[PDB]
Write a protein that binds this ligand. Structure first.
Ligand SMILES: *[C@H]1CC[C@@](C)(CC)CC1
Ligand SMILES: *[C@H]1CC[C@@](C)(CC)CC1
Ligand SMILES: [Zn+2]
Ligand SMILES: [Zn+2]
Ligand SMILES: [Zn+2]
Ligand SMILES: [Zn+2]
Lengths: 330, 330
């Protein structure tokens, strides 16, 4: 049993402490190549990511899942360089997020399945690097094209055993429609993580997903604009619920019997061109720990609130390995 | 005086017979790298383009202006390879078309100007290849972002002397708003071609642009779905006006005194991923001459209708050189 990373297959035991929803860079296809000065320089972005991943590794992280798709401007050569330099495994993604270009938006469910399978089974671009996860997205009711993407993701997962992870507008309970479409294609919920689920406090929605077997992505714990005075763009992005409020959803699901279905992450980035200029600076001021926020702050917080070390080890080590290890029914 | 091509600067005399609105490939940023099998293979696309450009050269073409932007998936390395193999100069474009990703759509007018200037003055990606034209787009009333793109294009042209060429929804008379925005930034109409202008028969609109000094892009002459039975997608793309009807607009503008302001092209492509699957096959059935259609069919047609050889030489050689040669007022 092996998980594909940007430096090759690794064993399940090698994955270790794993952050399941992260980004080296949140961008757009071709953007880093065409306009590296937007990030200062490509080298500056690399250096920032390596420093961040090294600090995460010192805090105990061993693997991150970079859920950047084609249309987030995923650059697997960049991921490989940062992964080598920081000694942190990086799992790359296929799929499509919320900004597909026309050349993707016009494609059929069969064509999309071919593209996702290409990136899982053959390689990404000419790199030979294979994706270990499929990323999809809705923001409210699925567009007709997003329905095709979700179905193609299910077909690619059914052929390969690679899991699916989703972006939702959690306030619209998107996981319900995503589940319906996935299940219509015959995909096991055990192969699916419904992400950005910490954006909502609706326990009925969260437990309805977990009851049918879905993994719950509580993946934006440090995202908060509390204490940011009069920054409309940061408030729209990050919300005004505290990181403690988000983190307590981890305890809530544990207390309901779902500890094996919880996946926790920061949804951090080291560059961020697909939003307003200087958002990365704002985010780094909110959370200077970056990707180390989960082990340095969330884990001790949950221990203080009575969650055991063993349970948190299961959530951060056992659950990601069970999720990522290719299979049709985990 | 020199015009930048994908193989370096050329003199005005070297440009020769020039098609001012063409594409090697109409695609999306990063798409050819990530999914070359969509085109059969990258090599198959290269071979098809080289054969087409060789046939165009045999018909008299010496230069094409590839008006593919970043978001049309412009690959200047591909353009250079095809240009070398076919012995046809290719001018590359900067700017943005109708499918910018989030990382572009969130940018300011100043940021966009920096990006356009980068591609004109420094190089595209890491290739050192510099754009010789700026391409912009509206489809009806400009979106707020498209207003910024048009202003940034004007600023980049004012700094460099490189011309601007536009995509319009001609039925909505977009050239009127485009002109208004360009002029508000102080750009000379002599540096601007309002493209897809052969999509309309409205002489009041066309002469209103030409009267204030704009160049008129009659650039889709072979685009027609006449005789295509019950193909809705091809009819939506190509329209149901004949190529003869489009070509007679060249004569119409000559007869009104605007021969020096007419630019003629095919708006052909050798691959086309940003529309429905197999559209390239449909288009090649409509116009097997491809980019050779203008010299092989339109020029003799206009001669038969009484246009002189000298006038057509002025339109196909003199006007493109005057347009492309960098200057603030041509
Ligand atoms: C991990 C161990 C199980 C509890 C204590 C719930 C019984 C939660 C922490
Ligand atoms: C080019 C020469 C001028 C005419 C004949 C109009 C007088 C048009 C063709
Ligand atoms: Zn997301
Ligand atoms: Zn994310
Ligand atoms: Zn166009
Ligand atoms: Zn075009």
């Amino acid at each position: 049993d092996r998980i594909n990373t940007v430096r090759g297959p690794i064993t399940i035991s090698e994955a270790g402490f794993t952050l399941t929803h992260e980004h080296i860079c949140g961008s757009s296809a071709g953007f880093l190549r065409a306009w590296p000065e937007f990030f200062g320089s490509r080298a500056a972005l690399v250096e920032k990511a390596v420093r961040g991943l090294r600090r995460a590794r010192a805090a105990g992280v061993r693997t991150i899942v970079d859920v950047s798709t084609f249309d987030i401007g995923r650059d697997v050569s960049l991921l490989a360089e940062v992964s080598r330099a920081a000694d942190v495994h990086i799992v790359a993604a296929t799929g499509l997020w919320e900004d597909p270009p026309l050349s993707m938006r016009l494609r059929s469910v069969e064509e999309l399945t071919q593209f996702f399978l290409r990136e899982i089974q053959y390689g990404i671009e000419d790199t030979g690097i294979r994706a270990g996860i499929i990323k999809v997205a809705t923001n409210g009711k699925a567009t007709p094209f997003q329905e095709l993407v979700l179905r193609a993701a299910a077909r690619a997962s059914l052929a390969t055993g690679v899991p699916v992870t989703t972006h939702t507008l959690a306030s619209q309970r998107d996981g319900e429609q995503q589940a319906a479409i996935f299940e219509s294609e015959g995909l096991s919920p055990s192969r699916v993580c419904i992400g950005h689920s910490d954006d909502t406090d609706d326990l009925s929605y969260l437990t309805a997903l977990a009851a049918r077997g879905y993994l719950i992505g509580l993946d934006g714990i440090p995202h908060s604009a509390i204490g940011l005075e009069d920054n409309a763009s940061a408030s729209a992005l990050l919300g005004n619920r505290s990181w403690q409020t988000r983190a307590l959803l981890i305890k809530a699901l544990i207390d309901q019997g779902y500890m094996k279905q919880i996946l926790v992450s920061n949804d951090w980035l080291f560059g961020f061109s697909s939003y307003v200029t200087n958002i990365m600076d704002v985010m780094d001021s909110v959370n200077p720990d970056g990707m180390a926020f989960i082990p340095l702050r969330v884990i001790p917080f949950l221990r203080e609130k009575g969650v055991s070390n063993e349970t948190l080890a299961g959530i951060t080590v056992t659950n990601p390995a069970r999720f990522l290890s290719p299979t049709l029914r985990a």
